[PDB]
């Protein structure tokens, strides 16, 4: 996958393993939810290219958003929006199969690297608009949980278990977007 | 109310209704979310001791969380919880009832601040630590939606109608705190 560099990044997370324990403490994260985590691993793999789809069919209808994808003359970048759809989709398995162990926070805040100016337009060597504003990022917790659902109630598992994927998938990409919010903030603020 | 100054700021807040717009767009919130956040008014209204409870129980058995709320000496300050719990309270009522204008979009702003270093520790003059960090606004996300849901369902209400109130009760906690994540952010990338 081009441009996925995940356990070699070159950079060490600002963040430790102590860090992450309170932030998953925070967003009621559990041992329970590991497992669930993986459960949707198996549920959501089969239909990743039909989530990705739902995702740009949500980005590519609302012109302030598709704008972070688009060439400094307004039109979308097709290469763009095609090599970050493959690290995206690589991401949600990522989610459910990885340790969130030193590794995964070292890619975390390259995740947030590439979101913000520091990073963003790099990775793909293209040229676009500068940076993402944070406030989009904390906004698209709503949509990137709540789409998700429909995809996890598919494959025909127990409401419960239902239930109880979705809501692990809700920590996880709220306890994601969290993290990235490090080179957004303010030094010592985070 | 001591402390509420709801619609008497000054320092009018950096982001207009546009940007509210477009916010709320990324957060999927539409007149169907105004319709049921406020039916989610009456619903939580009788029950808002006992959701307080709940969110203080969780705090207060963090001692990593209940630390925000804590004198020099790490314990507990006490005249801090009471003030902030009574406006606290107010803001459920507030996020149900009020109609998401400028006036609202200011102290949208004020509270942002009041969580920041900025503001923090001057509305109720007490002496605590200087800064909630902003990793945890956005880890926060989770435990004040999911643990609203079973109060949502207590009114016997029917479940895509308790649904209805859910999700935008979960919209609106998104789309806030996405606001309260100015005075964190580096100028210029929010
Ligand atoms: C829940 C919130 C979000 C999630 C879970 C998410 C997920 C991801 C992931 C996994 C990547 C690939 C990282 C990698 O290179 O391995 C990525 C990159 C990217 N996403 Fe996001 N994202 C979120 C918010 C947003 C928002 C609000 C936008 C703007 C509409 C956006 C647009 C982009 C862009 C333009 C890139 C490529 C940046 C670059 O040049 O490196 N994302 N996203
Ligand atoms: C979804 C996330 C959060 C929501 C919805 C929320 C809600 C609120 C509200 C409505 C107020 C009263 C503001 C006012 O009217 O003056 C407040 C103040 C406060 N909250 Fe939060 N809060 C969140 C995150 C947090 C976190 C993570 C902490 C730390 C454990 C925290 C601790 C405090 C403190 C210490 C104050 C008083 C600050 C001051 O003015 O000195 N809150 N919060």
Chains 1, 2 share one sequence.
Do not use: C
Request: glycine share 6%.
């Amino acid at each position: 996958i081009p441009g996925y560099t995940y356990g070699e990044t070159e950079n060490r997370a600002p963040f430790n393993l102590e860090d992450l324990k309170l932030l998953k403490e925070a967003v009621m994260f559990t041992a329970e939810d590991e497992e669930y985590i993986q459960k949707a691993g198996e549920v959501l793999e089969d239909q990743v290219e039909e989530i990705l789809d739902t995702w740009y069919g949500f980005v590519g209808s609302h012109p302030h958003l598709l704008y972070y994808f688009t060439s400094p003359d307004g039109t979308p970048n097709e290469k763009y929006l095609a090599a970050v759809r493959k690290r995206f989709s690589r991401w949600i398995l990522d989610t459910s199969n990885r340790s969130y162990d030193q590794a995964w926070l070292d890619y975390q805040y390259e995740i947030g690297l590439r979101h913000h100016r520091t990073k963003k337009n790099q990775t793909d060597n293209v040229e676009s608009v500068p940076n993402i504003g944070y406030r989009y990022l904390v906004a698209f917790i709503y949509p990137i949980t709540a789409t998700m659902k429909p995809f996890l109630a598919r494959k025909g598992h127990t409401p419960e278990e239902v239930e109880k994927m979705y809501q692990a998938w809700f920590k996880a990409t709220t306890l994601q977007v969290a993290l990235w919010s490090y080179p957004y903030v303010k030094y010592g603020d985070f």
